[PDB]
Design a protein around this ligand. Structure first.
Ligand SMILES: Nc1ncnc2c1ncn2[C@@H]1O[C@H](COP(=O)(O)OP(=O)(O)O)[C@@H](O)[C@H]1O
Ligand SMILES: C[C@@](CCO)(CC(=O)O)OP(=O)(O)O
Length: 313
């Protein structure tokens, strides 16, 4: 028997932005969404996880002990008993350079560690258990561009494009320093909007459009749609009191409308205080070098693959 296993996953960015979860425990998405897994050129932006045999159950985030994760570990106690010789395992996670979408990565890394222990497991089944840790875990488990179909009862994640399809594109992230609204605050309020039912329908409509664009690798059509979805999403949120796009972020966006005339770009805003800007590779350095970032820090990002594990120790 072994003593521990390591694994790694990459953070995610919504493309069809998810708002609302069926239940605070199982965290099933109330509607269909889509996303991409991202990192930087070196793959340095990531979440690393270690699951190991222990006398008692410990959960560690960035070296800090934590009093959701235990639920997943317990459900797969049989896997660990076989691999380690005990059901009692501890979890240790370390995040690096992640902007938004950290929880997705942490959850996916758990899944890839489990699949690494019992490879014949159905990853789509494991994904269901992982949503308790983060509702968008599928994005990071499968990588690339995914669509997660959902009616609020059952959710299923599908790979639509590999990261290689995005070889000609880059994402420049502008990180602002504004305090962010917890994701749970967003899920809680968006359902209160009168426009929510319509939003659930349009979200599904957009996902289908993304799948068609995928047929001919219309990468630009997909990011353009993501900008439109971003605008709808955050209009609904503002209407319920959740304002993600703050002053300097609005300013950056207005700047982007001008630059778009010069060379193509499209932006996405999730729940955090970041503006993600899609752009062609030949223009990435150019965008990355602009001066008036309105106090924001800049990161160069790429689309990457799904969670993976290492040989058991
Ligand atoms: N590596 C990890 N493993 C498990 N849970 C994590 C990990 N990183 C963060 N989390 C949990 O997810 C929460 C943040 O999730 P969320 O609000 O979705 O932020 P983000 O959008 O950046 O993921 C944190 O408060 C933490 O409790
Ligand atoms: C709010 C959102 C996910 C919340 O579960 C929207 C989305 O990306 O689909 O973004 P973020 O919290 O990961 O930043």
């Amino acid at each position: 028997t072994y003593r521990s296993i390591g694994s790694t996953a990459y953070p995610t960015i919504g493309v069809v932005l998810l708002g609302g979860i069926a239940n605070p425990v199982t965290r099933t998405p109330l509607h269909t969404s889509a996303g991409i897994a991202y990192s930087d050129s070196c793959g340095s932006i990531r979440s690393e996880t270690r699951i190991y045999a222990d006398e008692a159950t410990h959960i560690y985030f960035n070296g800090t002990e934590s009093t959701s994760v235990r639920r997943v570990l317990d459900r797969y106690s049989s896997v660990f008993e076989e691999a380690f010789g005990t059901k009692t395992v501890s979890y240790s996670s370390q995040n690096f350079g992640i902007l938004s979408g950290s929880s997705d990565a942490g959850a996916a890394s758990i899944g890839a560690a489990i699949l690494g222990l019992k490879p014949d497991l159905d990853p789509h089944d494991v994904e269901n258990d992982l949503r308790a840790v983060s509702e968008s875990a599928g994005r990071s488990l499968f990588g690339g561009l995914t669509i997660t179909w959902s009616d609020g009862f059952h959710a299923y994640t599908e790979k639509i494009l590999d990261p290689e399809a995005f070889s000609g594109y880059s994402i420049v992230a502008f990180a602002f320093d504004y305090q962010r609204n917890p994701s749970d605050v967003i899920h809680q309020n968006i359902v209160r909007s009168d426009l929510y039912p319509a939003r659930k329908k349009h979200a599904d409509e957009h996902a289908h459009m993304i799948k068609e664009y995928a047929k001919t690798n219309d990468i630009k059509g997909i990011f353009d749609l993501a900008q439109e979805d971003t605008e709808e999403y955050h209009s609904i949120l503002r209407g319920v009191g959740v304002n993600v796009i703050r002053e300097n972020m609005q300013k950056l966006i207005s700047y982007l409308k001008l630059i778009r005339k010069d060379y193509w770009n499209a932006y996405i805003v999730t729940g955090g205080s970041n503006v993600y800007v899609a752009v062609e590779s030949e223009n990435a350095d150019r965008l990355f070098s602009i001066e008036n970032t309105f106090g924001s820090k800049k990161k160069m990002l790429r689309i990457v693959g799904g969670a993976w594990h290492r040989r058991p120790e």
